[PDB]
């Protein structure tokens, strides 16, 4: 319920760089992995779960993308974090993503 | 322990360029972003008319719209203003003229022109009946009234608002 | 019944509540209802402006302060550039522009 | 663009395929020179030049029309101070082969519009 | 002492030409009636000189800014025509030479 | 609307610099010294911050709830 | 008609009897003064020129720079006889400089009789 | 990146319509030839001139 429509959110998440300095040489291309969904051998799951329950305009940033793998994290998590959305009170953004 | 800044600078090997982004240029400017704001009863009347008289004498240190300008001083506050034509440049008083005082008179009495014309007198700086311009204060205030006049009456609370905007000509 | 025990003016449409209070003040020729309306309207205005600043309190405040100081620092930069227009030889003889001056 | 140059996207080349300056600045939009000479939209060229000044100088250039404080030579003088060719030309390298293009290319920021006329 | 203190207050800010005295004041006036009582209750004055060379006509805690804007087309010789003698003495104080209208 | 995550032309992440940019402008850095201090060298990156209009701050004035 | 035009103009410059939108045209060659007050006359403001100086002086600019802080406004430029709404039929009879420093400076005079200047 | 002053009052810097893009005036591959433009595909991938189209259907 941010002021940006979902494709815009998704697009911005796409452009967030991830610290794949090593794991990129391990993972398969998903097109080549033999599993019906994403798996940790061909993807890294991400979650974003943010709701602006306060008056101050919440900045959703790459600091809110929680990886399932401590080595594939958004670069600015390991300076400032990449802004994905600014949220007003009572707006929220819950999504999960795979890289 | 001793630590001179001249010794502090010698601890570094080399730390100490140009600033040409800042240069002032009349065909170039700056930028502008998104803010949020942009372009009844008599016992009450007595106190209300008696408060402004009291509270205007308090200490003032602020301006209504942006309390950033400090005050310097305060100027406290019938009448009959002889209007003048800017072309004829009527010199009713001795201030438009060169001398600071009347070189031809001593008392610029606003003697009436006649009996049927109290406001439309004949104001002239002529202590004699001759050798002065006959400035007939024609009744122009009847169709040119008003404007309030005040003075530094020794820092006193008074008023001397004008009765009419009477205007004289060379009669 | 719901609006009986639950106040409305603190809703997001506080501007509409202010418009309604203004209409009630204007509709009334009695001074008592006009003064009660004026008091209610001033209170609701203060409350709504406080809430607006509280939501404006962070980040919004920062960009307001930067725009307001930017325009003033731009006026300072323009006036210094104006006195920098006094410098000679800032124009070129190779006719990079021309202007009429007839008669 | 703001100068009545109009045209359909004729192809899209990835960043690897677009030509590039010494630094890896590839154009975003490459428009054919033949748009200019019959149309004499020299305001377009001066926009590109002063936009390149503005982007380096780090503040927004003035393009108010009749402002004799602005002229092309004054802009070129500024642009030369940032270490670019004073006329906005640059040596580009062909994205396909990497060879320098023998003609230096006029490249710089210009304000493009996208029109409602999508295909 | 002899300085220009001319002011051209509008209709709603018409200050009483005489000091406030309890033997010259009476209740005759009452959003519609809110502007009516304001005429004879809030409107004696003072003008503050700011550092920026502007001034404001206050009328208490209120502040109306004023410019001493020139009025050479009506440079009337404002004088105390207090009605003595014939037609008043018209004591020569300050020539009214401005059109200062108060505003918020 | 919001700041682009990457400079369209080259690829440098500029989506983590806007609030920094504005904070440096609030330190009254001149407008190009803010960019020099963030680390934007290429004029292609600089026109990301100079040109950006942050309309999301206006869109957030509208209430969904409260 | 040399008194009427100067007085009607003075009154426009004083906003009192004649509202700013009124346009007084003095046809010299044919002895006609035409005054239009009706609606739908397109007009535009012009700086007034008197002798050869503008009436818009550094006072107005300084006051107007602190506007809102002093609640000065464009209406004060109008009501100070500094700018004037001219309309296309009165534009017939203005002599209109285009900037002061260009057109009113002591070159070998083009006219030296400008009544108005482009803003 | 370059404006008239007039477009201050048009409020164009608040509701702007366009992107300052690093244009190059080159013939290059010829797919820009008769009044055409070559765009950067990777810039588009980054959101260059990406837009959204809203169509509203009303029925009562
Ligand atoms: Zn898998
Ligand atoms: Zn870049």
Curated annotation (Swiss-Prot), chain B:
Component of the PAF1 complex, which consists of CDC73, PAF1, LEO1, CTR9, RTF1 and SKIC8. The PAF1 complex interacts with PHF5A. Interacts with POLR2A, TCEA1, SKIC3, KMT2A/MLL1, SUPT5H, RNF20 and RNF40. Interacts with UBE2E1. Interacts with PINT87aa which is encoded by the circular form of the long non-coding RNA LINC-PINT; the interaction enhances the binding of the PAF1 complex to target gene promoters and may anchor the complex on target gene promoters, sequentially pausing RNA polymerase II-induced mRNA elongation. (Microbial infection) Interacts with influenza A strain H3N2 NS1 protein; the interaction interferes with host cell gene transcription, specifically with that of antiviral genes. There is a cross-link at residue 30 (Glycyl lysine isopeptide (Lys-Gly) (interchain with G-Cter in SUMO2)). The lineage of its organism: Eukaryota, Metazoa, Chordata, Craniata, Vertebrata. Belongs to the PAF1 family. This is RNA polymerase II-associated factor 1 homolog. It is found in: Nucleus. The chain holds residues 98 to 335 of 531 of the full protein. It comes from the Eukaryota. It comes from Homo sapiens (Human). Residues 40-136 are annotated as: Interaction with PINT87aa. Component of the PAF1 complex (PAF1C) which has multiple functions during transcription by RNA polymerase II and is implicated in regulation of development and maintenance of embryonic stem cell pluripotency. PAF1C associates with RNA polymerase II through interaction with POLR2A CTD non-phosphorylated and 'Ser-2'- and 'Ser-5'-phosphorylated forms and is involved in transcriptional elongation, acting both independently and synergistically with TCEA1 and in cooperation with the DSIF complex and HTATSF1. PAF1C is required for transcription of Hox and Wnt target genes.
Curated annotation (Swiss-Prot), chain C:
The Plus3 domain mediates single-stranded DNA-binding. Component of the PAF1 complex, which consists of CDC73, PAF1, LEO1, CTR9, RTF1 and SKIC8; the association of RTF1 appears to be less stable than that of other subunits. At least in HeLa cells a N-terminal shorter form of RTF1 is also found in the complex. The PAF1 complex interacts with PHF5A. This is RNA polymerase-associated protein RTF1 homolog. Component of the PAF1 complex (PAF1C) which has multiple functions during transcription by RNA polymerase II and is implicated in regulation of development and maintenance of embryonic stem cell pluripotency. PAF1C associates with RNA polymerase II through interaction with POLR2A CTD non-phosphorylated and 'Ser-2'- and 'Ser-5'-phosphorylated forms and is involved in transcriptional elongation, acting both independently and synergistically with TCEA1 and in cooperation with the DSIF complex and HTATSF1. PAF1C is required for transcription of Hox and Wnt target genes. Residues 29-63 form a coiled coil. It comes from the Eukaryota. It is found in: Nucleus, Nucleoplasm. It comes from Homo sapiens.
Curated annotation (Swiss-Prot), chain E:
It is found in: Nucleus. Highly expressed in skeletal muscle and heart. Weakly expressed in placenta and liver. Coiled coil: none annotated. It comes from the Eukaryota. Component of the PAF1 complex, which consists of CDC73, PAF1, LEO1, CTR9, RTF1 and SKIC8. The PAF1 complex interacts with PHF5A. Interacts with TCEA1, SUPT5H and CTNNB1. Interacts with SETD5. (Microbial infection) The PAF1 complex interacts with Zika virus French Polynesia 10087PF/2013 non-structural protein 5/NS5. The interaction with viral NS5 proteins may reduce the antiviral immune response by inhibiting the recruitment of the PAF1 complex to interferon-stimulated genes, thus preventing their transcription. Component of the PAF1 complex (PAF1C) which has multiple functions during transcription by RNA polymerase II and is implicated in regulation of development and maintenance of embryonic stem cell pluripotency. PAF1C associates with RNA polymerase II through interaction with POLR2A CTD non-phosphorylated and 'Ser-2'- and 'Ser-5'-phosphorylated forms and is involved in transcriptional elongation, acting both independently and synergistically with TCEA1 and in cooperation with the DSIF complex and HTATSF1. PAF1C is required for transcription of Hox and Wnt target genes. Belongs to the LEO1 family. This is RNA polymerase-associated protein LEO1. The lineage of its organism: Eukaryota, Metazoa, Chordata, Craniata, Vertebrata. The gene is LEO1.
């Amino acid at each position: 319920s941010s002021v940006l429509h979902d494709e815009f959110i998704a697009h911005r998440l796409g452009l967030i760089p991830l610290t794949s300095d090593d794991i990129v040489d391990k993972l398969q291309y998903s097109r080549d992995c033999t599993c019906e969904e994403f798996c940790p051998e061909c993807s890294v799951e991400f979650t974003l779960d943010v709701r602006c329950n306060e008056d101050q305009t919440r900045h959703v940033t790459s600091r809110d993308l929680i990886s399932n793998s401590p080595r594939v994290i958004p670069v600015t998590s390991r300076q400032d974090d990449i802004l994905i959305v600014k949220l007003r009170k009572g707006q929220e953004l819950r999504l999960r993503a795979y890289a | 322990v001793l630590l001179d800044p001249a010794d502090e600078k010698l601890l570094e090997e080399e730390i100490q360029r140009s600033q040409q982004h800042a240069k002032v240029v009349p065909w170039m400017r700056k930028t502008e972003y998104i803010s949020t704001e942009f372009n009844k009863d008599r016992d009450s009347q007595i106190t209300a008319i008696e408060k402004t008289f009291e509270d205007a004498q308090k200490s003032i240190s602020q301006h209504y719209s942006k309390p950033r300008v400090t005050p310097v001083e305060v100027m406290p506050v019938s009448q009959a203003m002889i209007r003048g034509m800017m072309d004829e440049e009527g010199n009713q008083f001795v201030a438009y003229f060169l001398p600071v005082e009347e070189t031809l008179k001593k008392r610029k009495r606003d003697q009436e022109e006649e009996m049927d014309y109290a406001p439309d007198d004949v104001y002239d700086y002529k202590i004699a009946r001759e050798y002065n311009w006959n400035v007939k204060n024609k009744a122009s205030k009847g169709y040119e009234e008003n404007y309030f006049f005040i003075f530094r009456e020794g820092d006193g609370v008074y008023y001397n608002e004008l009765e009419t905007r009477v205007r004289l000509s060379k009669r | 019944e719901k609006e009986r025990f639950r106040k409305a003016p603190p809703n997001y449409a506080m501007k509409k509540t202010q418009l309604l209070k203004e209409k009630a003040m204007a509709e009334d020729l009695g001074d008592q209802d006009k003064a009660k309306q004026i008091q209610d309207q001033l209170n609701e205005l203060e409350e709504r402006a406080e809430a607006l600043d509280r939501q404006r309190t962070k980040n919004i405040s920062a960009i307001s302060y930067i725009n307001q100081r930017n325009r003033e620092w731009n006026i300072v930069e323009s006036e210094k550039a104006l006195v920098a227009e006094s410098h000679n030889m800032k124009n070129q003889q190779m006719d990079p522009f021309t202007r009429r001056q007839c008669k | 663009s703001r100068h009545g140059q109009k045209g359909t996207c004729g192809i899209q080349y990835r960043q690897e395929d677009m030509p590039f300056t010494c630094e890896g600045i590839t154009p975003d939009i490459i428009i054919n020179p033949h748009a200019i000479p019959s149309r004499m939209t020299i305001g377009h060229l001066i926009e590109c030049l002063q936009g390149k000044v503005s982007a380096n100088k780090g503040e927004i250039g003035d393009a108010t029309p009749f402002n004799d404080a602005v002229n092309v030579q004054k802009i070129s003088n500024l642009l030369s101070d940032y270490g670019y060719h004073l006329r906005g030309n640059e040596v580009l390298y062909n994205g396909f082969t990497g060879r320098k293009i023998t003609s230096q290319i006029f490249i710089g920021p210009t304000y493009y519009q996208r029109l409602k006329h999508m295909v | 002492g002899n300085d220009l203190y001319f002011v051209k207050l509008p209709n709603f800010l018409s200050v009483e030409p005489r000091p406030f005295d309890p033997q010259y004041y009476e209740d005759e006036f009452e959003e519609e009636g809110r502007t009516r009582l304001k005429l004879k209750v809030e409107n004696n004055a003072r003008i503050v000189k700011w550092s920026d060379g502007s001034m404001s006509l206050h009328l208490g805690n209120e502040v109306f800014d004023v410019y001493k804007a020139p009025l050479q087309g009506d440079h009337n010789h404002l004088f105390i025509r207090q009605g003595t003698g014939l037609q008043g003495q018209a004591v020569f104080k300050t020539k009214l030479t401005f059109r200062p209208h108060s505003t918020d | 609307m919001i700041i682009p995550v990457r400079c369209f032309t080259c690829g440098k992440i500029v989506g983590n610099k806007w609030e920094a940019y504005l904070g440096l402008l609030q330190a009254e850095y001149t407008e190009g010294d803010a960019l020099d201090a963030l680390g934007l060298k290429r004029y292609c990156c600089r026109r990301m911050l100079l040109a950006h209009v942050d309309l999301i701050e206006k869109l957030l004035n509208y209430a969904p709830l409260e | 008609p040399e008194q009427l035009m100067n007085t009607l103009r003075k009154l426009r410059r004083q906003m009192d009897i004649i509202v700013s939108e009124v346009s007084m045209i003095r046809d010299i060659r044919e002895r006609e003064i035409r005054i239009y007050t009706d609606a739908g006359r397109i007009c535009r403001p012009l700086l007034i020129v008197e002798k050869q100086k503008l009436l818009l002086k550094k006072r107005h600019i300084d006051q107007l720079k602190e506007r809102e802080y002093n609640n000065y406004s464009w209406q004060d430029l109008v009501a100070s006889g500094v700018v004037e709404y001219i309309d296309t039929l009165e534009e017939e009879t203005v002599m209109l400089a285009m900037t002061p420093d260009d057109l009113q400076e002591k070159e070998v005079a083009y006219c030296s009789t400008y009544t108005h200047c482009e803003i | 990146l370059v404006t008239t002053r007039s477009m201050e009052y048009l409020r164009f810097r608040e509701l702007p319509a366009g992107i300052n893009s690093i244009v190059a005036i080159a013939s290059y591959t010829g797919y820009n030839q008769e009044d055409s433009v070559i765009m950067n595909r990777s810039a588009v991938d980054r959101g260059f001139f990406r837009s959204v189209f809203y169509r509203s259907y009303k029925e009562q």
